[PDB]
Amino acid sequence: KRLNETQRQNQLDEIKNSVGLTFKKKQEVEKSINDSEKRLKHAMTEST
Amino acid sequence: ENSLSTTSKSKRQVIVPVCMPKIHYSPLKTGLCYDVRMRYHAKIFTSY
Numbered sequence: 243k244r245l246n247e248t249q250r251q252n253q254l255d256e257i258k259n260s261v262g263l264t265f266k267k268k269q270e271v272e273k274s275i276n277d278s279e280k281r282l283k284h285a286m287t288e289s290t
Numbered sequence: 291e292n293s294l295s296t297t298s299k300s301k302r303q304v305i306v307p308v309c310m311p312k313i314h315y316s317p318l319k320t321g322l323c324y325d326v327r328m329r330y331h332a333k334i335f336t337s338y
Contacts, residue, residue: 251329
């Protein structure tokens, strides 16, 4: 019981670490999304 | 080598007997307390 509980807890906080990792990667790709939108805007101006 | 050099071939008579040593620290160990059942209590991720 203690063995399975410890493996459960290790799986738990490893999942929590990976969740923090992917949330940081999303929070860092947001800025390049907005900058790419800005250059699409300027591309539309020169298109017109 | 020495000039002191005691010289008597005879069995020395016994003086003291061997008893339990009268110490009470450190033939013993150091106690540890631990259980995984403290790892049950976690936080509810609520804000984001």
